[PDB]
Paper text:
In these mechanisms, the effectiveness of inactivation depends upon Fc gamma receptors (FcγRs) expressed at the surface of effector cells and the interaction of the extracellular domain of the FcγR with the Fc portion of the antibody bound to its cognate epitope. In contrast to humans, macaques only have one low affinity FcγRIII receptor, CD16, which shares a polymorphism at position 158 with human FcγRIIIa with Ile158 and Val158 variants. Similar to human low affinity FcγR receptors, the macaque FcγRIII receptor consists of two immunoglobulin-like domains packed against one another at a roughly 80-90 degree angle in a comma- or apostrophe-like shape. The Mm FcγRIII forms an asymmetric complex with macaque IgG1 Fc with the Fc binding near the bend in the comma-shaped receptor; the majority of the receptor’s contact residues to the Fc reside on the C-terminal second immunoglobulin-like (d2) domain closer to the cell membrane.
We also determined the high-resolution structure of the Mm FcγRIII(Ile158) variant alone (apo), not complexed with Fc. In structural studies, we used receptor variants in which glycosylation sites at Asn38 and Asn169 (two of the five total) were removed by mutagenesis to aid in crystallization. The apo macaque FcγRIII(Ile158) receptor, expressed as Val158 variant, was crystallized in orthorhombic space group P212121 with cell dimensions a = 49.1 Å, b = 67.0 Å, and c = 69.7 Å. Crystals diffracted to 1.9 Å resolution with one receptor in the asymmetric unit. The model was refined to an R/Rfree of 0.182/0.218. While one well-ordered glycan can be seen attached to Asn45 in the apo macaque receptor structure, no glycan is visible linked to Asn162 due to disorder. In addition, there is a hydrogen bond between the Asn45 linked glycan mannose on domain 1 and Glu166 on domain 2 which is only visible in the apo receptor structure due to its higher resolution and better resolved glycan density. This added hydrogen bond may provide an explanation for the detrimental effect of removing this glycan on expression. Receptor crystals were grown from 25% PEG 3350 and 0.1 M HEPES pH 7.0.
Residue numbers in the entry: 4 to 174
Amino acid sequence: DLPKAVVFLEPQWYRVLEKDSVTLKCQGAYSPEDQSTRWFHNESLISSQTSSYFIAAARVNNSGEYRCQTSLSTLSDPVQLEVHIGWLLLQAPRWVFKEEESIHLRCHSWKNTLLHKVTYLQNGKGRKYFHQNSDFYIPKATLKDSGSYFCRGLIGSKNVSSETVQITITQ
Ligand SMILES: *[C@@H]1O[C@H](CO)[C@@H](O[C@@H]2O[C@H](CO)[C@@H](O[C@@H]3O[C@H](CO[C@H]4O[C@H](CO[C@H]5O[C@H](CO)[C@@H](O)[C@H](O)[C@@H]5O)[C@@H](O)[C@H](O[C@H]5O[C@H](CO)[C@@H](O)[C@H](O)[C@@H]5O)[C@@H]4O)[C@@H](O)[C@H](O[C@H]4O[C@H](CO)[C@@H](O)[C@H](O)[C@@H]4O)[C@@H]3O)[C@H](O)[C@H]2NC(C)=O)[C@H](O)[C@H]1NC(C)=O
C-alpha cells in the first residue's frame, strides 16, 4: 500500500459553465524511470499522460468523476466536476463546510459576459448586493449559513438568475 495520488481542480470551482477552462492536476510520487500519469474519467482511462489534464472549453459531457495515478502512488479518490448550461452559475469550491471555515462564492456569467447589479440570495431572500460584480465571502461560517443559494444580475439590460445550490454547514 503506497500513498494515494490526489486530484485537484484549478481554479477550485467544482461547478463550471460550458466554455469555461478547467485544469485537473495530479499530485503523487513518481519512480525515477516512469514520469507518466494515468487519468480516468467516469472510471475509464483517458488520453492524457501528463500531470495536468486541461479542458480548454468545458462541455456537459466533461461532467463526472476524475481520478489519477502516478507510478509510485495508488489510484486517487474521485473528484467530481459539474459542467452546467446557463447564463449564470453560482460557484463554490464545495458544498459542505465545517463551522468557522471560510465560504467563497462567485456569481459567474457565461463566457465571462459583463454582469452588474448582482444579488446573492439565501433561502429565497436577498443576502448581499454588489453594484459591480464581486465574489461573496463568508469569513466564518455558522449554522445560520446553511441554505439554498443562488445569484442574479443584469447582463446588458436583461435580468438573469442562476439555479440554486444547496450549501450545508456541519459540526
Ligand atoms: C460521465 O458521467 C456523467 C454522469 O455522472 C455524464 O454526465 C451526464 O451526461 C449526460 C449526457 O450529456 C447529461 O444529459 C444531458 O444534460 C444536458 C444538460 O442538461 C441540463 O441543462 C438543460 C438545459 O439547461 C437549462 O439551463 C438554464 C436553466 O436554469 C436555462 O439556460 C434553460 O432552462 C436551459 O434549458 C436542462 O434543461 C436540464 O434540466 C433537466 O435535467 C435535470 C437533470 O440533469 C433536471 O433536474 C431538470 O429538472 C430537467 O429535467 C439539465 O439541467 C441536456 O441538455 C441533454 O438533453 C438534451 O440533449 C441531449 C443530447 O444528447 C438529447 O439527447 C436530449 O434529448 C435533450 O434534447 C442531456 O439530458 C447528464 O445530465 C450528465 N449527468 C450529470 C452531469 O450528472 C457524462 O456525460 C459522462 N462523460 C463521459 C465522457 O462518459
